[PDB]
Symmetry: D2
Subunit: 330 residues, 4 copies
């Protein structure tokens, strides 16, 4: 945008880039459906990643638009807006006090890049649906973390398009390390890995060693990646912790995507997946259940790790939790 209105409104919104509760939907509209491109770019300047890793601006914008282009516009929930949100949320979690000066620039880059591509080329249906229809993607990945593996493959592969290699100036050592962290992070986003991820996180909280700086102590890759994996995982499962105004938009979108999968399964004569049958759904009830058995249990543990950094996030969560609970019909 130039010295006009359309710009001011966008730039004014990008001002909240470092705050939980960013009006990502507003930005999506204002940026002409380029929330991932503008939010990623802003965060990259904000963290001075272009300079640090010598990323030509044009290569970065080209890769970003390409990546965003590979998110499906026709998918209600798993699209570029969700990706921008997970990225922005991770960017905020990276700045939590308890993690001050803990992670390197490269590790920061990995968490942000991973967030950016963690759902690219999502068809809007689950792994199980792809497995049951014997999709080519499922045959390729042996029914294991099919989509997650695919998100990774596409994210890296897009680096190869014209003027898209944003890591062209990283040394071989940086590339090997970045790639491994990105893979470890994205694969951890598969919900089939939630429980174990949460378990290890709790075990870590029970070993919580703070440094002379009062900041978490991570002296090995295993601990370092585990925090990064859970961070991005919390960001991916953070809709319930956002201002009700946003949380509600996310809920309607996920439900629309689920119901759409349900209709496809109904068409094909397949068994309709949980929460995907629009004729017998409990949106309000499912949200409460989602928060009770997964979101709240996860964020609570995370709050313990960075205590008291995420205290406000939890309150918002428990609050939103009540809101939906009180909307449950009778």
């Amino acid at each position: 945008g130039v010295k006009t209105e359309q710009e001011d409104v966008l730039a004014k919104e990008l001002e909240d880039v470092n705050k939980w509760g960013l009006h990502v939907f507003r930005i999506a509209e204002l940026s002409g459906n380029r929330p991932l491109t503008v939010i990623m770019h802003t965060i990259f300047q904000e963290r001075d990643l272009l300079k640090t890793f010598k990323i030509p601006v044009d290569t970065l914008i080209t890769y970003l638009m390409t990546l965003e282009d590979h998110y499906h516009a026709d998918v209600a929930y798993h699209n570029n807006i969700h990706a921008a949100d997970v990225v922005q949320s991770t960017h905020v979690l990276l700045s939590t006090p308890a993690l001050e000066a803990v992670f390197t620039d490269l590790e920061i880059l990995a968490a942000i890049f991973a967030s950016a591509i963690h759902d690219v080329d999502h068809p809007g249906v689950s792994n199980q649906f792809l497995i049951n229809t014997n999709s080519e993607l499922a045959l390729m990945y042996n029914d294991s973390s099919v989509l997650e593996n695919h998100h990774l493959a596409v994210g890296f592969k897009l680096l190869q398009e014209e003027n898209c290699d944003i890591f062209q100036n990283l040394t071989k050592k940086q590339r090997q390390s970045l790639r491994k962290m990105v893979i470890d992070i994205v694969l951890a986003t598969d919900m089939s890995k939630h429980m174990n991820l949460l378990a290890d996180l709790k075990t870590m909280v029970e070993t919580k060693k703070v440094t002379s700086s009062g900041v978490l102590l991570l002296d090995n890759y295993s601990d370092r990646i585990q925090v990064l994996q859970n961070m991005v995982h919390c960001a991916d499962l953070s809709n319930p912790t956002k201002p009700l105004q946003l949380y509600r938009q996310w809920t309607d979108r996920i439900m629309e995507e689920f119901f759409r999968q349900g209709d496809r399964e109904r068409e094909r004569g397949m068994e309709i997946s949980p929460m995907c049958d629009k004729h017998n759904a409990s949106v309000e009830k499912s949200q409460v259940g989602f928060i009770d058995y997964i979101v709240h249990p996860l964020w609570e543990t995370w709050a313990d790790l960075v205590h008291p950094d995420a205290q406000d996030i939890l309150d918002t969560l428990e609050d939103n939790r009540e809101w939906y609970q009180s909307t449950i019909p009778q």
Copy 2:
């Protein structure tokens, strides 16, 4: 969706619309809305039944429906022109062209099957951007197909690959001979939809019109495979370029869609600092002029030659084309 084995009110209305399946000018857009965005599946199913293809090739009905929905699911809902509605249109248009009097009893069931299947998969998984855009961005699709008929090769590969999903092999009961023949014809047909082949296709079509030969029943005579497939390639190519030959109401809807798709590519090209492709600049475009040029240089030359081949069965179609051409002519702002 029905109630106690009876059609729903919507299914009934859908059925009444499908009554014009054998007519040029079907309200394909209404069919799309009434079918819940399943124009390709219903039109294909209607056509297979009408032509008794399920029995002839022993295609179980469940398998056909499953493959149809799967094929339709792979057309992009976010692509304004090259989507399932366009596929359904090319299918129904080819279906009407196959029934032309001049081609009565000319083709076998397998050739008919091939022309129809080819029409159904001809643009599957179209990304909404041209081959050149895929080539210039060094997409993996262009790498895989060596920048040659990139999209056309991809449509074919996807069309056939989907037969491998659960209960999707509609050709499971065909012998190897039928399958190799079917496959060869379908591949020959779809690759012929690449506009870069237009001129040579048209050159060949004319050659045939020059040496055209009618049989005992005033029907076209096509010996060798070269001439039979050539006619099928041109038939599906005509169908793919039939929007301007349709009643103005339908034609204008197609024009809005292709222009919307073109402008989106232009916008992406501009964002990327790439040269903007012809007719893709929403800031510097002449929709009317382009449609006039499109008809004069490509569509009319092709259809006039086809009208000649099946003379005089395509007379009305040609008259409608010329009328739409003049209409756009008088709209060009001066």
Copy 3:
């Protein structure tokens, strides 16, 4: 249609050898020669007939043979160890392990089919280099599989993909539930052959041995999918690492082959200026020492645990392993 699945005038001598298909120590190399380098095809064919799997799963014989030939053709003839002979060996070995008294009537026909098929495809299209080599060169394969169990994921993909070639779907008559169950078990088994999972597999095998339960019949009790697939994973893993437990004559040919393959990789890593992988440096090698070490830290701890699970069915296999270990120890140049 031939007797053993492949034409051969030495068929008589092939029959003599194949009579030992149920025996530990089959002359797989001799069978490879007599069958015309078709060890995997004839041995698999023989086992399927013997176990009556063609009848049970309604597998047409021509389809089974076509798939087997296709699968075998996809093992590299230029790879000294991870080839069709190793595949045939693992299959036959798994076949014997499945027949151990302690497991009589424990596994279903579907589970048996999974273990055998998994063994057959577990190394298909192996390039003769390790996962790290594929990862360090940024190969397309490692890119696709995100550096995780690259080869193993590939073996599975190819194994299932080949079912799509002409007349190769040996599972065409299985119900959808049988296919999904089979598919899941096969994947679970092949992914477990990744040596990076050896320790965790063994640790679990030991825990099972500690909590070992038997039925009224003196047969292993396996209550849940978890314990079932675990025994099958370790079973195939044992067969894959069974060379040191075979008659010295056979064991030595396997050692010569794996060493040749390792050195082959070492020369490639040397040319490329890469760090040479362990045991892959022909200039600094201790073949004998390495075998003894392999037995002491990997092979014996695994087989001792397996022997305890099916005690005393594998006592002779364990005794041979120890006889062979001593042999290599006595050949270490001092």
Copy 4:
């Protein structure tokens, strides 16, 4: 070093037609493709011209050579080395002095190097008949040729393998198109049209102020490069008899293996692939009479008289096989 001397000794003929490519294979430890490419790249100063780091070049050459099947009797790294070296000699022909740019030269050499990479040792039809994944991906059209290209370019993406990293975008785009055009033209299904176009060019042949071929447009320039590499690919019968017979034995061994596999599967056995009903000699004479001679004869015209000796050797070899045809 003892053999390093023999290698360098043999490599002195890299500019000569009839190089003992088989000996180079042995002396180099089966690295003919890599060594010959390296020599030619230095010989033509290509590393400097395009700023190709030596380490990157050799890594890619080894990687490309590794993707040639060592189990395949004919379409392997030895055949690729041979086609590259032959293309190298043809490019140096007097009638073409200073005609082609270093990018066009690079294109022809590169294309020759990758033109058969990852060849399975069976024909396109075999792949099509078995519904192989490759045929499904390429819609039964130039299946293998398309694949050779795809692999050739994909391998540039491996660790330190991008030999074109320092070419401008303009050069990369131009090179890619030329390489694709050249390799796709090695598909025998394109033979007749290529020849027809080469003959036409010979009819309307024009030369510059220096007497070298006058190639005015891309269409004409690429057509000459396509046919050059095509001639290099079909140059076995033009080499001295001793090498030629070694190649015939290799191709027949590959064909027979395919025939054995087709018979095992109950498939129709492809022409010349039935070891129980073969006519090696007859096939070579027919191959020369209907394809190799018509092609080389027209090329000889185009570069007259540069290829006279090559054509004479070809005709002699043909007479030789003729005399071995039974009955």
